[PDB]
């Protein structure tokens, strides 16, 4: 319970709400939690659920990972480092997922959302998977607005963690798809100052960070020592006036606590 202490201290330090849930990957048992059932904006962490839905379609044969999508200047929105470079040659579904998950490319996420019918459809995907809490209502970049008490584009730590576990280990996705999803998360490029910074050598981590307005910051992860994941950890925070670095630091320290008492 020293991680719980650190989480509560993170709220003290940031002057904001922090939601936390640590699950045992195997049994799917809750090992520790804080504000597990309160809602928080997902921000880019929803992109892992989005690609989960895409892979489900690939598995059912309604989509191809190699299918190439061409888009136009009209599709671009901010924070789209990869997609802005492929206006001419386009990008495949696989490349779009890699960009959305590993670089938080907003346009990539919007393009993929279109392949499934929009945000309501992702929410439909979540419902039929057994997650009646998690909801996506808007597209990028609006969905990161995080206006207080607004439930649009939110999830609960326990809901997101459960859904993440179902996607990574359940029978929902084929073995090949489960492995591609976790591969994208392991290749995450924008989460170094978070859980990864508290990680000693030889540890395995596959994650997805998220950043939004009004202090919203978050991360979902599957990690474990000896190059093998063994626990799901979800952390969300919102409302803080602190710098991004100060918020990264608090999440990092929560990570250190998890590791030191693992």
């Amino acid at each position: 319970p020293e991680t719980l202490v650190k989480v509560k201290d993170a709220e003290d330090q940031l002057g904001a709400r922090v939601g936390y849930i640590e699950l045992d990957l195997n049994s799917g048992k809750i090992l520790e939690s804080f504000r597990p059932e309160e809602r928080f904006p997902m921000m880019s962490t929803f992109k892992v659920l989005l690609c989960g839905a895409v892979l489900s379609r690939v598995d059912a044969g309604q989509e191809q990972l190699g299918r190439r999508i061409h888009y136009s200047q009209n599709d671009l929105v901010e924070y789209s480092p990869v997609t802005e470079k492929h206006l001419t040659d386009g990008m495949t579904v696989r490349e779009l997922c890699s960009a959305a998950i590993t670089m938080s490319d907003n346009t990539a996420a919007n393009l993929l959302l279109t392949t499934i019918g929009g945000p309501k459809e992702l929410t439909a995907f979540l419902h039929n998977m057994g997650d009646h809490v998690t909801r996506l209502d808007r597209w990028e970049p609006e969905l990161n607005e995080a206006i207080p008490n607004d439930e649009r584009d939110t999830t609960m730590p326990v809901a997101m963690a459960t859904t993440l576990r179902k996607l990574l280990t359940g029978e929902l996705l084929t073995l090949a798809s489960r492995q591609q999803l976790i591969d994208w998360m392991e290749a995450d490029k924008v989460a170094g100052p978070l859980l990864r910074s508290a990680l000693p050598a030889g540890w395995f981590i596959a994650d997805k960070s998220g950043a939004g307005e009004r202090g919203s910051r978050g991360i979902i992860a599957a990690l474990g020592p000896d190059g093998k994941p063994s626990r799901i950890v979800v952390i969300y925070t919102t409302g803080s006036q602190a710098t991004m670095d100060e918020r990264n630091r608090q999440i990092a320290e929560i990570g250190a606590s998890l590791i030191k008492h693992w």
Binding site: S72, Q73, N74, L76, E78, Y79, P81, E84, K85, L87, T88, S104, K189, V190, G192, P193, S209, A211, G212, M244, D245
Partner: protein, 273 residues
């Protein structure tokens, strides 16, 4: 002018590009914002921070001293040292292969997302990606140019106070307004919008869906400098920073005492003198 402190803000600082390390917090006279990294010039030496996946922070030995200017793009970095342009980082599109004419006599540089530009004896020299025509220099920009800047899919230049613009024009970001055909002192290129500074007045054109060209009243006179990110802009007036576009604003820390500004794709930087 050597800054005594530096303030960076805007974006999610996902790559650490908006965290100016202690060593660059003072004594720096210039900063260049890249997509995943930042560069600073201190006593002629190039400093850097952020992500280095493409080697944009693996400083060539020659940049350790005597550098006069710097610029940054998506995957590369540029330095101007005694008329010579030095480049490093990602080169998938030839943006770091400096042509012979840009190895001496150059008095200014600018980086585009995947391109590089040098100004020498009034002539703009460009290299790197050209899939949007951003590196095919118009005949007009090959003589008499006094200022230049690179955008994501575009580039701009000032010739006899008139703007010359090329590359993508999907949103009219390259259609120069009658008002910017003379008296212009500087230009800045956004992803889908463009800026010109004319005798203290900020003129903007191109996309406006995210308010990029909705110039605050205060920025219509007395502005000494401008800068553009991809979807937001900056203006400097009497030491006070003004920002607009994509809900960007200027924190109280840059409301006074700023001597120069820099706009990266997402992160803004203010050098307080």
């Amino acid at each position: 002018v050597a800054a005594t402190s530096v303030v960076a803000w805007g974006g999610n600082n996902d790559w650490g590009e908006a965290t100016v390390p202690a060593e660059a917090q003072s004594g720096v006279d210039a900063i260049a914002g890249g997509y995943f990294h930042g560069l600073a010039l201190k006593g002629g030496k190039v400093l850097g921070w952020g992500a280095n996946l493409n080697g944009q922070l693996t400083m060539p030995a020659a940049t350790q001293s005597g550098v006069d200017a710097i610029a940054a793009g998506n995957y590369h970095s540029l330095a101007l040292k005694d008329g010579e342009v030095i480049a490093w980082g990602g080169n998938e599109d030839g943006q770091t292969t400096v042509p012979a004419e840009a190895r001496s006599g150059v008095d200014a540089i600018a980086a585009g997302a995947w391109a590089s530009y040098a100004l020498k004896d009034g002539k703009v020299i460009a290299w790197g990606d050209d899939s949007d025509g951003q590196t095919t220099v118009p005949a007009e920009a090959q003589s008499g140019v006094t200022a230049l800047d690179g955008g994501v899919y575009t580039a701009l230049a000032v010739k006899n106070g008139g703007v010359i613009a090329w590359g993508d024009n999907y949103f009219g970001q390259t259609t120069v307004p009658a008002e910017a055909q003379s008296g212009v002192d500087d230009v800045a290129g956004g992803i889908f919008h463009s800026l010109a500074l004319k005798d203290g007045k900020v003129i903007a054109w191109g996309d406006n869906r995210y308010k990029q060209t909705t110039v605050p009243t205060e920025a219509l006179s007395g502005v000494s400098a401008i800068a553009s990110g991809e979807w937001y802009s900056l203006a400097l007036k009497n030491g006070k920073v003004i920002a607009w576009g994509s809900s960007r604003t200027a924190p109280s820390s840059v409301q006074s005492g700023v001597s120069s500004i820099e706009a990266g794709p997402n992160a803004a930087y203010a050098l307080k003198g």
